Design a protein around this ligand. Structure first.
Ligand SMILES: NC(=O)C1=CN([C@@H]2O[C@H](COP(=O)(O)OP(=O)(O)OC[C@H]3O[C@@H](n4cnc5c(N)ncnc54)[C@H](OP(=O)(O)O)[C@@H]3O)[C@@H](O)[C@H]2O)C=CC1
Ligand SMILES: NC(=O)C1=CN([C@@H]2O[C@H](COP(=O)(O)OP(=O)(O)OC[C@H]3O[C@@H](n4cnc5c(N)ncnc54)[C@H](OP(=O)(O)O)[C@@H]3O)[C@@H](O)[C@H]2O)C=CC1
Ligand SMILES: O=C1C=C2C(=CCO[C@@H]2O)O1
Ligand SMILES: O=C1C=C2C(=CCO[C@@H]2O)O1
Ligand SMILES: O=C1C=C2C(=CCO[C@@H]2O)O1
Lengths: 224, 223
């Protein structure tokens, strides 16, 4: 058996990933939503496949993250594959035109949120077998790619989390953790369906055997 | 031919040494900032002896202080030739699991948001200037592609985040002929603050291309 944990599972790639794991035999899935009672798709998913466990998480709300270890501990003794998926993407374009609020929100939600989530869930991951850790990042997060676009707070936040992911990989290598930053695709770079992003992500999540990688969905490396 | 320099965090360290180096140059006006100017003893004495050195208050962690910096600089000058975001903190190193919430937050507000907001407030003054030079004092520890065998935690993450946004800014302001750089001032193989300041002032004067990540000697660093 393997416990997978996915934040932001109510819709998007996160829902598509949970949908797909719900298929795989002997897979337990802790799936989070900000508002589980409005998570119509995902409550139905869990009712048909009750190995899918639904759980409250707002990654922008420290009081929500302060409860995530108990909330997950209701359903499991461990986590094999942690996925920080929940995230926002609200501000793009020039720096002179990006207000304080946008920088602050992208930091708390996209950088602090995941770091606090991993910190809270590290004890549970440490007791698991696979010790796999996936921050859903973005290719716009690279300090060494040029898309001919500005990503403002969005890009900054993905780069900030990339930096810390890189360090965390170094830091946990001794404990045989597999730590990766992963660009899931776009759902101009070719867009893919959420179910396509999910399928490639599930494959990467099972295939990846080395730490400190920055991966695109298809398994090819990106520059940091 | 007169040039105005803006230096955040001028009360001590590299900042003090840069203002001290600039104070020696003819036709260079220096707007030097301190969180608490009344206790900025060395800086106030420099300003007492060299009237081309103007001391203004700035806390870059504080929106209310940032909201005032443009009007306050404007009393002492109509333009900025060279903008130097030097003020910053370095209080968080070591492993992610030992780094509490408040170190991430403080390094974000002081080292990312502050420099960003400070540039936004002071851009009009810089546009009106001749040199249009914009330096963010960063760190080689912020590179995504250097390995020092050290964990830089919130310090390192904040310099990476400022580096990403600096590089974007260099693209955005290329059409207005701004020069934007992120600059590692050295470790103060260690050097002295005065050595760092000598090298940085050479660099500020010579850099004629935007979007570079540089060390104090003018050699390039990878982002
Ligand atoms: N897909 C793309 O085009 C690209 C996206 N990415 C990454 O892929 C992921 C995108 O996921 P996807 O579901 O497809 O995106 P969506 O924009 O469709 O939704 C984001 C998800 O995160 C949740 N969420 C947002 N804010 C919070 C919060 N503060 N607390 C908790 N949950 C929150 C949303 O829940 P709610 O219903 O409450 O809003 C939702 O489940 C992110 O990690 C993103 O960084 C990176 C590269 C490109
Ligand atoms: N080894 C090194 O020297 C390295 C340093 N750097 C960078 O060099 C720069 C300066 O370093 P150094 O001179 O040695 O630093 P010091 O610690 O000696 O001095 C830091 C300066 O920043 C000011 N500052 C701190 N917080 C604030 C704030 N909230 N508002 C306004 N000013 C503030 C300090 O003011 P106060 O006295 O009031 O606290 C002081 O003037 C920084 O940008 C730092 O990131 C990066 C790479 C390596
Ligand atoms: O330019 C972009 C980048 C993204 C986007 C949508 C939200 O996710 C990507 O960050 O528009
Ligand atoms: O998105 C955000 C922004 C903040 C937050 C919580 C702590 O206060 C921050 O402004 O979540
Ligand atoms: O150093 C900081 C930290 C904060 C701040 C302003 C807004 O609240 C943050 O805690 O400056």
């Amino acid at each position: 058996e393997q416990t997978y944990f996915i934040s932001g599972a109510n819709r998007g790639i996160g829902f598509s990933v949970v949908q797909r794991l719900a298929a795989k035999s002997g897979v337990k899935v802790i799936a989070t939503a900000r508002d589980p009672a409005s998570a119509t798709a995902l409550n139905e998913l869990a009712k048909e496949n009750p190995q899918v466990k639904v759980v409250q998480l707002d990654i922008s709300d420290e009081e929500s993250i302060k409860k995530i270890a108990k909330n997950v501990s209701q359903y499991t003794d461990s986590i094999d594959v942690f996925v920080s998926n929940a995230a926002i993407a609200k501000s793009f374009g020039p720096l002179l035109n990006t207000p304080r609020e946008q920088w602050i929100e992208h930091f708390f939600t996209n950088v602090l949120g995941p770091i606090r989530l991993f910190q809270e869930l590290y004890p549970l991951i440490k007791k698991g077998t696979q010790k796999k850790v996936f921050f859903i990042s973005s290719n716009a997060g690279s300090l060494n790619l040029d898309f001919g676009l500005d990503f403002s707070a969005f890009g900054q936040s993905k780069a900030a989390l990339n930096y810390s992911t890189k360090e965390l990989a170094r830091q946990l290598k001794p404990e045989n953790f597999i730590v990766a930053a992963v660009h899931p695709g776009v759902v101009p770079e070719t867009k893919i369906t959420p179910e396509e992003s999910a399928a490639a992500l599930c494959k990467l999540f099972e295939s990846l055997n080395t730490t400190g990688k920055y991966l695109s969905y298809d398994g090819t490396e990106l520059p940091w």
